[PDB]
Symmetry: C2
Subunit: 207 residues, 2 copies
């Protein structure tokens, strides 16, 4: 997706600023708009009947979210979109967007569509891998592999002993579907194992 | 996408018949081809290390499979594409697709990409749900849910007791992500609980 296509698409979008820890939408909310992350980071979370959460991923600038309704006929969202930092999001209704595809943005339709396909593909892969790990790996193995993915993210701040990640016991718990305490227990085992050390929301992964 | 866009798309594809139980491609194989299911039923399976499989879904006529490499430049496949029945699949290389997307197929590009988008979105939603289930629901619980999903499968052959759903113990375990054995333990416990009959290769779910 080139700079022109992006700017042309954003001209018809509505830019809004969001504080951190803010749910942009939750399961059941009207599904009529598409969001484009201009700045900041957000997370997509699956919710359960007992209010238990499964974090599916983190998304930054250039990512389209709340896009499902643009492809699947539905009056409601199926997940929670939450801000992890202060955010700026551009939004545009599905109707308006598709209208633009038949006219104004007619030329960029293929590019915007392909780009959304790129993200959906990445997401399907990661989610496909999260499903596999949830079915065949113990919590310790899910946590180690998760700490290693997190350290591959551009957000991974370097450290003299390896990579300095930024995760809390709660989020870790949310990422691998285990209790907060279990995540806390696994962290002290890995530290005792010499694979890393932790401090509040700072995990220093060795490597 | 219309039948007109579909036919032109196939005009450049190589249709090949596949026997049932044939893994069209496994993780590791080259990924320079896209597949379009013309007829038949296939399954997308993911593998782990302990040599375990998790069915992520079944797909019929009209489905684009093996499409990942068309979006995420990769040299290899990440999943197993396995025919569940005899199938007719039309394949086309990625390279020749986008070259076509810039030539006689440029006008079809929008509808093609969007259709693939629709399919990617359904699988994402379905897999997202699976992960959620594999995280918070128990085996027996997941198996019951999956038994009902198949009852609504066009295959579901109605029965005087309920519905006759042909699903091997192996596939059940691959569906809910449990050992072929454990899956058995629950099929018998459900054959006791009075709600289904574990008939060798088939399952008669009482009720629905």
């Amino acid at each position: 997706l080139d700079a022109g296509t992006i700017e042309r698409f954003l001209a018809h979008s509505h830019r809004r600023r969001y504080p951190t820890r803010t749910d942009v939408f939750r399961p059941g909310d009207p599904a009529g708009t598409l969001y484009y992350v201009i700045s900041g980071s957000v997370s997509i979370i699956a919710e359960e009947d007992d209010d238990r959460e499964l974090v599916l991923g983190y998304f930054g600038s250039g990512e389209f979210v709340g896009e499902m309704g643009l492809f699947i006929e539905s009056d409601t969202r199926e997940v929670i979109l939450r801000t992890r930092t202060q955010c700026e999001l551009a939004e545009i209704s599905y109707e308006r967007l598709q209208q633009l595809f038949q006219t104004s943005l007619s030329p960029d339709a293929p590019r915007i569509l392909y780009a959304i396909g790129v993200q959906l593909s990445k997401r399907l892969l990661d989610t496909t891998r999260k499903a596999s790990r949830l079915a065949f790996l113990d919590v310790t193995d899910r946590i180690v592999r998760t700490l290693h993915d997190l350290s591959k993210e551009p957000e991974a701040m370097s450290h003299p002993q390896g990579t300095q990640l930024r995760v809390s016991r709660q989020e870790l718990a949310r990422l691998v579907g285990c209790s907060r305490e279990m995540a806390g227990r696994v962290l002290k085992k890995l530290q005792a194992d010499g694979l890393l050390h932790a401090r509040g929301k700072t995990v220093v992964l060795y490597g």
